[PDB]
Design an enzyme around this catalytic site. Structure first.
Site, mmCIF file in Angstrom:
data_model
loop_
_atom_site.group_PDB
_atom_site.id
_atom_site.type_symbol
_atom_site.label_atom_id
_atom_site.label_comp_id
_atom_site.label_asym_id
_atom_site.label_seq_id
_atom_site.Cartn_x
_atom_site.Cartn_y
_atom_site.Cartn_z
ATOM 1 N N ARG A 51 43.084 81.476 106.070
ATOM 2 C CA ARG A 51 44.422 82.032 105.923
ATOM 3 C C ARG A 51 44.732 83.033 107.026
ATOM 4 N NH1 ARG A 51 43.437 83.814 101.577
ATOM 5 N NH2 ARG A 51 44.440 82.319 100.159
ATOM 6 N N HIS A 52 43.747 83.864 107.348
ATOM 7 C CA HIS A 52 43.943 84.943 108.306
ATOM 8 C C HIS A 52 43.165 84.708 109.594
ATOM 9 C CE1 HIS A 52 46.202 86.986 105.299
ATOM 10 N NE2 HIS A 52 45.166 87.238 104.519
ATOM 11 N N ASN A 75 34.069 75.812 101.691
ATOM 12 C CA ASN A 75 33.450 77.119 101.436
ATOM 13 C C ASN A 75 34.382 78.199 100.880
ATOM 14 O OD1 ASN A 75 31.359 79.464 102.094
ATOM 15 N ND2 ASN A 75 33.240 79.922 103.257
ATOM 16 N N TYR A 119 36.480 80.817 87.899
ATOM 17 C CA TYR A 119 35.544 80.628 89.002
ATOM 18 C C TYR A 119 34.366 79.751 88.587
ATOM 19 C CZ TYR A 119 32.467 82.079 92.886
ATOM 20 O OH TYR A 119 31.632 82.112 93.983
ATOM 21 N N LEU A 121 44.942 77.170 102.266
ATOM 22 C CA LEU A 121 44.265 76.020 101.662
ATOM 23 C C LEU A 121 44.897 75.560 100.348
ATOM 24 C CD1 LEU A 121 40.712 77.192 102.549
ATOM 25 C CD2 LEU A 121 41.747 75.083 103.365
HETATM 26 CL CL LIG Z 1 40.892 81.288 103.454
#
Ligand SMILES: [Cl-]
Ligand SMILES: [Ca+2]
Ligand SMILES: [Ca+2]
Ligand SMILES: [Ca+2]
Ligand SMILES: [Cl-]
Ligand SMILES: [Cl-]
Ligand SMILES: [Cl-]
Ligand SMILES: [Cl-]
Ligand SMILES: [Cl-]
Lengths: 258, 258, 250, 247
Positions: free
Chosen positions: B39-40, B90, B153, B64
């Site tokens: 993302r970053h 990951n 999770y 994602l």
């Molecule tokens: Cl990410």
């Protein structure tokens, strides 16, 4: 063996046919009070047989993919009985959503299988705590063996095994046990109907059964139910977090055996 | 040991920090070409160090959870390199969504963890077939041990183990191997930052580390990475469907040991 | 990937053919020093290839079922090299001792398969502690799948997986890692000793072919190395999907 | 739940105390006929309680490490009852034989723990085939968790898990099911250091009881478990599989 389930109130999802129906019937036989949550109404013959063994057994029409319906059906059950002693998460469908199907199909499969096991535990656990009740999650061998074109169902069934460990940890101090039963090949009317779409249904059935090590036969819903109901009972009072395979040796015995 | 990954193109999701970053760096060290989806933007020092090992290594900004961005980023990678040899799923976050959180929170956790592993495999597999490439799914010990207030999770990480078996079966004829690595306690900057929120961060760190059997210390990202990269390579040419625990004994050794 | 095994002295039991031979050969390629313990002399081609990779590689004739011979060969290894960095327990035979065979045959199978894994660890561990070395136990999928007519071998191979967990616990504070590799079907002289071949190969999910000794060796040698520095107690299946993938697949 | 074990003849090794005793007692309660094989005679209180539930239950003095005693005791059981429906392999001792102990001590541990499970199966299986009976092997969590300083017991207990899979395969066509139960911490004669250990059991921070092990073992012997074979059932309060970090 007295399972000490008399008058214990147990919700069974998809509890009117196949594995779920056998679990509901067994609960009634052990003098428990099964509460069937299912989309479509049970057969008249099923309801008659259930009521004959346990007049207090109930059926509620529930679309499990509708969170509000899960919420309200659990609320109605508590209003009727004042308590909840068990939850059997059982509803599901092997919907054959492969790698190639894409996001929307994969998520829809999670809704059909995984997400309502969570929803039902979410709504049931606050009541199970008071009774030191129990959860049984019905999974599938595919969670550990794979199958090949069923990512959605496989993912769901594997998440259900993981959640069995998670909830066992989460609820240990409350004495609420959480276990899973893992069937492989179980003969049900829905399976029989699927087999009937093949050119030679008897040969297709035999081809599948041939690969089951113990007796080269399908497991019965009654066999699944006997282990599931044992796990709901205080006869299994130090069993929590476990995955019980009831599968004729399908998962664990040498693939090369005939 | 020559891993024969030279010039092999491997997408690593969340590949610029923690475990993902270590995997990207090891890939670069082996002269593979890591392609970071995150993302970053990776920090400057990371990019310099990566380019130093592998000038062709790339980063693409990708959310994602957005299916179209996954689709387009894979397409961009094929346009740039003409091939894809590996996928390392990951990216994830332990978001602490318990039994009490409800549907929307649980589903959001699945989106943050599970669903993009499927989306990425969906978009990458057609290309991996051509190169007889490989997939590694990074999971978590919590998939099998539970933790207690992290249903979202846990479910996601367990589904990732199940999908590892499923995709191994699905892709067996195409020679595409699919394996998982299961870390337990791994020290990363983000973990370090979470620990820093406690009254006594050093005591909290010690409390956690004391429970790891081998050395009473956290696993390193490089330790996770070296097993992950081994699994991407043809040195692991008959390993498929497997879950490799890299955890200092956390999952499998006697809980009673000090 | 540098495995940092250069000059590491590693005993490989049954290390001159099949899986054991490939492990020794891979160690030599990584510039480790394999020391083969086996009953029979390795063939010339094996020795030629092994020494070409690592001139210091050695073979010692050892009957592993003789406790004294294990003890003395470990001592001889320490006298020659001054240290021990690894033990690969690998020697074994699927001797087909079933339920009908009786006590004496069962115990003989344990001697041929299980007991020398313990004896070797017993004599090697003090030296492995000194170097913070490592153990790899080679087991068999039969430990978890069963097979039929092979109680002795199955019991032995299962015990070896248990001992992998036990020794990992026992040796954790000494920094000695202990892991296992679990093959299923691997083409070796032991295997050919044990058509039926094509039938069995068809049942291996990945490629419908047997695993190679080289494939087993690559994972075994990885586990001996510091690249696996936080892996201990683990059972690594290198089997083309034999153990864990759906039995119904073709 | 009717387990359909009435008048079924089941040998229980080490069946006069601890886990074995609880299994024998539960079998009697379910109207099966337990036959106790053990080195020492059970106490009179146990025998009285056993007879109250099942007057046909018997005890035979057996040194399980003596192959001939195993053979002759099985023969005597068949002579007495005419059938054998179950075998529970349970006798054993965590004898603390570690890496430093050496060959003789290790092998002696195998004799005390592993070898008689095979011997008993060897002699019982022909009779179990005749009745489509069942075997239950009692193992230990140490088989999969390790413990330290107990190579002999750990090896034995792990071999027993392997043999459960092996015999399940070998006997599938004969309808003889073979399963294992894996206890962790159970308060028995063989069993602050105690408070320390109990605190580590996730479910209730307390030891599993022999009755709990027995309930699962007896279920596995019964046709209620008619499609369960080769399995390892952990009855351990979450000891083996739940997060080590939980308090
Ligand atoms: Cl990410
Ligand atoms: Ca109880
Ligand atoms: Ca290879
Ligand atoms: Ca039955
Ligand atoms: Cl999207
Ligand atoms: Cl040899
Ligand atoms: Cl046999
Ligand atoms: Cl005894
Ligand atoms: Cl020890």
């Amino acid at each position: 063996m007295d399972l000490n389930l008399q008058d214990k109130v147990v919700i069974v999802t998809g509890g009117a046919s196949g594995i779920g129906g056998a679990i509901s019937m067994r609960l009634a036989e052990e003098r428990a009070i099964p509460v069937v949550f299912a989309r479509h109404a049970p057969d008249g013959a099923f309801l008659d047989a259930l009521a004959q063994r346990q007049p207090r057994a109930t059926y509620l029409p529930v679309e499990l993919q509708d969170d509000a319906q899960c919420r309200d059906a659990v609320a109605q059950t508590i209003a009727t009985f004042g308590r909840l002693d068990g939850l059997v998460n059982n509803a599901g469908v092997n919907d054959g959503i492969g790698l190639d199907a894409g996001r929307d199909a994969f998520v829809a499969s999670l809704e059909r299988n995984l997400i309502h096991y969570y929803a039902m535990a979410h709504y049931c656990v606050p009541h199970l705590k008071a009774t030191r009740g129990a959860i049984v999650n019905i999974s599938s061998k595919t969670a550990v063996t794979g199958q090949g074109n069923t990512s959605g169902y496989c993912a769901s069934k594997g998440a259900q095994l993981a959640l069995t460990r998670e909830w066992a940890v989460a609820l240990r101090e409350h004495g609420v046990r959480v276990n899973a039963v893992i069937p492989a090949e179980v003969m049900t009317p829905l399976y029989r109907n699927w087999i009937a779409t093949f050119e030679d249904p008897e040969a297709k059935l035999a081809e599948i059964a041939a690969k089951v090590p113990l007796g080269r036969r399908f497991t019965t819903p009654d066999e699944i139910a006997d282990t599931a109901v044992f796990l709901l009972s205080p006869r299994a009072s130090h069993t929590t977090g476990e995955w019980l395979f009831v599968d004729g040796g399908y998962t664990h015995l040498d693939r090369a055996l005939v």
